[PDB]
Amino acid sequence: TLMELLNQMDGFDTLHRVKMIMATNRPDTLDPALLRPGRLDRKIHIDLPNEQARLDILKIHAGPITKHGEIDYEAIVKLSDGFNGADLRNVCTEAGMFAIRADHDFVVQEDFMKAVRKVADSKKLESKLDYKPV
C-alpha cells in the first residue's frame, strides 16, 4: 500500500492542485522515500508552547469560562509550567469542575492555583517519555 503512495507522488502526473498535509506521532519510521521533498514538502512542527504564548493559550481557555472577576493570568502561567493547550484548558476546566464540586457557581483562581497546579502535577507524572526523535 506504500508503493502506490510513492508512485502516485512519483508520477507521470502533476498533483499540484492537491495539497497533502501529513502529521503523526513521529517523523521517523516513514523510511527515506517519504522523508525527501516531493512526498514531504516542508518541515513544520510544534514544541512546548512558551509561557508567553501560554499566557495567550489561557485567554482562549479563560474566555468561554466566566467567574468572579479576580484573575491573574500569569499566576497560573507562572505556577503551572511546561504544558499544552489542551492539557492546560482541560485541567483548567477540570479545576472549574473540581471547584464546582463544592456546588458554588463562580470560582476565583484560588482553587485553580491549587487544582490546575496539583492536578497537572499528577498529569505530568505520565509526561514521561514524551520526547521523540525528529
Binding site: 506521532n25 492539557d87 484548558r89 482541560n90 477540570e94 505520565e126
Partner: protein, 146 residues
C-alpha cells in the same frame, strides 16, 4: 505500538485507539457516552494519551488500608455468621501486602476448616488461623527457634 518496526499487529490496531483519539481529538462527535479505561498496570503505553479527549483522570489505587481492609471482608463476611467476637484489627494490623481479594479468600479457608470441623459458626481462633493459612508460602520447617 512498540516504537520502531518490525512489527506489531496492534501497531495497526493502535490506530483504532488513534481513531478513538481522532474521534476524541480530531473529531467532535465523541462528546457523549463517556468512556473509561482500566489496566492491571499503567506501565508502558502511548504516553501522549494525556488530555480530556483521550484519558485524563489518573487515580492510583493503593493497597487497601485497615479502614477498608477491616470493612472489606466485614462486608464479604456479612453474608455469613460470626461468633460475635472478632477483632478485625487483628487482620487489619497484621495485613501487609494483602489484597482486597485475598481478604475474600481469608474467610473462605477459615470457613473451610470450619466446614471440616463440623462447626456451627466461625470463630476468631478459626479466623486468625486463616490469615497465615492462605499467606505466606512455607511449609518448610519450624526449628532452631523451636
Amino acid at each position: 505500538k512498540r516504537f520502531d518496526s518490525e512489527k506489531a499487529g496492534d501497531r495497526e490496531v493502535q490506530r483504532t485507539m488513534l481513531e478513538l483519539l481522532n474521534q476524541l481529538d480530531g473529531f467532535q462527535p465523541n462528546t457523549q457516552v463517556k468512556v473509561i479505561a482500566a489496566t492491571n498496570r499503567v506501565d508502558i503505553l502511548d504516553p501522549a494519551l494525556l488530555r480530556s479527549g483521550r484519558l485524563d483522570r489518573k487515580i492510583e489505587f493503593p493497597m487497601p488500608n485497615e479502614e477498608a481492609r477491616a470493612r472489606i471482608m466485614q462486608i464479604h463476611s456479612r453474608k455469613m455468621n460470626v461468633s460475635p467476637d472478632v477483632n478485625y484489627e487483628e487482620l487489619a494490623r497484621c495485613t501487609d501486602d494483602f489484597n482486597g481479594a485475598q481478604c475474600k479468600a481469608v474467610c473462605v479457608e477459615a470457613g473451610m476448616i470450619a466446614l471440616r470441623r463440623g462447626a456451627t459458626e466461625l470463630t476468631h481462633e478459626d479466623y486468625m488461623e486463616g490469615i497465615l493459612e492462605v499467606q505466606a508460602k512455607k511449609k518448610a520447617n519450624l526449628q532452631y527457634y523451636a
